[PDB]
Amino acid sequence: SLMIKVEDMMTRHPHTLLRTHTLNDAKHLMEALDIRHVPIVDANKKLLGIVSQRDLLAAQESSLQFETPLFEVMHTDVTSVAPQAGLKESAIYMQKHKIGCLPVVAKDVLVGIITDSDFVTIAINLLELQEE
Numbered sequence: 001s002l003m004i005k006v007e008d009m010m011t012r013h014p015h016t017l018l019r020t021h022t023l024n025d026a027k028h029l030m031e032a033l034d035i036r037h038v039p040i041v042d043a044n045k046k047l048l049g050i051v052s053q054r055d056l057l058a059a060q061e062s063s064l065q066f067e068t069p070l071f072e073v074m075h076t077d078v079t080s081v082a083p084q085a086g087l088k089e090s091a092i093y094m095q096k097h098k099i100g101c102l103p104v105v106a107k108d109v110l111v112g113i114i115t116d117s118d119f120v121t122i123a124i125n126l127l128e129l130q131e132e
Contacts, residue, residue: 005086
């Protein structure tokens, strides 16, 4: 039994946006950092939702028929986890429920995110261990 917790492998201090910032802002932020998930938070860093590249692409495609506020784009259903959660359990949850990115929250405050990028890092460290 490995005791790895979500907080041990999550991306800490993720870049976030206010709900009144726009699709265009989230697009730009995603391009600048080459990321695909931007949590939406209030002034006290409390998680309100999250937008993915897929969300932005679907809104843009659905418009061909940039200024939309993020609160209109983000899904009203929000999945999150606590930082003390076990890593294997949380990954299995993400797998089973087809969740690509899982925000990590403590007392409503966003403390981190789990993304595919975090699993790459952890796969590398495990393979390195297996080699050693």
